């Protein structure tokens, strides 16, 4: 199973590796190649949002109707994301101790 | 009646299903989707970002 997700940084849902953390690259000498870290232990991540009213339907032609943001009921809160602290800390620590094999 | 972080009202006018009349409708567009035109400090006549 291959899930065609779209993400720039911090790879979302997909197959994991085995044994330990693995690092892939092209040359490992120049700075122009994007280096890829494949983990072994997953880290949970959640993202939320405040409320919206509905899809306000605006008609601009014979059948061509679009949906815009309507009202907002309640207070205004900022859409945030949450990651556990110690799991991310020891995951980045494992990334560092395994990346230290290529840099003495 | 309050302060929002990144939204603007942006009420405009648009053509209905009949190619005679135009009606005023409102929305709530985000701040990165809204770009001001002209050069002056009149912060009223905004526009959509991908219409350029």
């Amino acid at each position, epitope marked *: 199973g291959i899930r065609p997700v779209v993400s720039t940084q911090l790879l979302l849902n997909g197959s994991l590796a085995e044994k330990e953390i693995v690092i892939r690259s092209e040359n490992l000498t120049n700075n122009a190649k994007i280096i890829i870290v494949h983990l072994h232990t997953p880290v949970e991540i959640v993202c939320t949002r405040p409320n919206n009213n509905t899809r306000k339907s605006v008609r601009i032609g014979p059948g061509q109707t679009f949906y815009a943001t309507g009202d907002i009921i*309640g*207070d205004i*809160k900022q859409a945030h994301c949450n990651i556990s602290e110690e799991k991310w800390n020891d995951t980045l620590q494992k990334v560092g101790i395994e990346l230290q094999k290529h840099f003495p | 009646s309050g302060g929002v972080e990144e939204m603007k009202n942006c009420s405009f006018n648009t053509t209905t299903e009949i190619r005679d009349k135009e009606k005023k409708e409102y929305a709530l567009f985000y701040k990165p989707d809204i770009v001001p035109l002209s050069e002056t400090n009149n912060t009223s006549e905004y526009r959509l970002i991908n219409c350029n």
Partner: antibody
Amino acid sequence: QVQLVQSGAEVKKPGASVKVSCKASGYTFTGYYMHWVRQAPGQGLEWMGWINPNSGRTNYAQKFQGRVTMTRDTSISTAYMELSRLRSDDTAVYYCARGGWISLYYDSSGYPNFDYWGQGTLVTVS
Amino acid sequence: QSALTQPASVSGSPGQSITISCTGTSSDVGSYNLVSWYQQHPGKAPKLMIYEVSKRPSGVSNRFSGSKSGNTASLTISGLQAEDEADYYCCSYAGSSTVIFGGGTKLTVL
């Protein structure tokens, strides 16, 4: 210990406007909500809208839109209610209460955790 | 979208348990677990009894117990004394940032 002080009793006539002020002392009122209730003598409690003093956002209940306005004042730590077009059944007592905690991460406006209440203002008409 | 259903008045001798219940619409009480009770002494401001369906705040002894079942929220008192001559009010979050209050019960000590 924190306290909530209110204004005095008012005697008015129909077709006027009434202003009720509630002042909180002893705690940072900017990080807490403020709710309003009205009590006529004889029946139960009724709920009016809430004010967010950190941003001034209002959301009144049903059958009250357009005639009641709420305004915070962060300089002297007060909250004002201006209610216009009074009727004969508006003779009541008004209470201000402290709602939930403003967290900037989840909508905690509708939480009915009213901990501290005021003495209330007795308004009447004839 | 009226007030919550609640009986007129209750009665009971001291020394036993009295159960009060409030019923409402499924979108009001049956959907969210945000209900609470208020004790109204005649003459001054009321005081909150329990926070959530079952959550005891400080300053009140372990004597009130709250529960929810289906569309009915119940509050139980055990060991009645003479310091309960006050009204009782239910309240619930009704969605869209609006709180719906109840009718009210009066308890008498025989």
